Design a protein around this ligand. Structure first.
Ligand code: CA
Ligand code: CA
Length: 112
C-alpha cells in the first residue's frame, strides 16, 4: 500500500482491502501526479471508518493529504471530511494505522 503513482486524471483510491478491515500496522502512501495546470478535487465516497482516540485528535490511525504547502488532516472517525479542492496537479496522501481495533477505512475518488 506504498508506492502507488496515479497518473490518470480521474480515479479511485482506497485503504487496503476496503471495505474489509484495513491491516494493522499500516504505513501507506499514494501520489496523484498529473500534468501542470490540472486541478484535483478529492471526494470521499461510501463509508468512512478510521479509528479515533479519546485523548488526542487522530494520533495513530489517520489519513492526511498534502498539495504544495497545503496539508489537510489528519482525519479519522466515522465521518469523512467534505470534498477538498486541492488546486493542484500533485497530491500526496498517507494513511497510518496501529495494532489495535478493526475499522474498515476509506474510499476516495479524485478528479481533474
Ligand atoms: Ca507496518
Ligand atoms: Ca487501529
Amino acid at each position: 500500500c506504498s508506492g502507488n503513482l496515479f497518473t490518470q486524471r480521474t480515479g479511485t483510491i482506497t485503504s487496503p482491502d476496503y471495505p474489509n478491515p484495513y491491516p494493522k500496522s499500516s504505513e501507506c502512501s499514494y501520489t496523484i501526479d498529473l500534468e501542470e495546470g490540472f486541478m484535483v478535487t478529492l471526494q470521499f465516497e461510501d463509508i468512512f471508518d478510521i479509528e479515533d482516540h479519546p485523548e488526542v485528535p487522530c494520533p495513530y490511525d489517520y489519513i492526511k493529504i498534502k498539495a504544495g504547502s497545503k496539508v489537510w488532516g489528519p482525519f479519522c472517525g466515522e465521518k469523512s471530511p467534505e470534498p477538498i479542492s486541492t488546486q493542484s496537479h500533485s497530491i500526496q496522501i498517507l494513511f497510518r494505522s496501529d495494532n489495535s481495533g478493526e475499522n474498515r477505512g476509506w474510499r476516495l475518488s479524485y478528479r481533474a
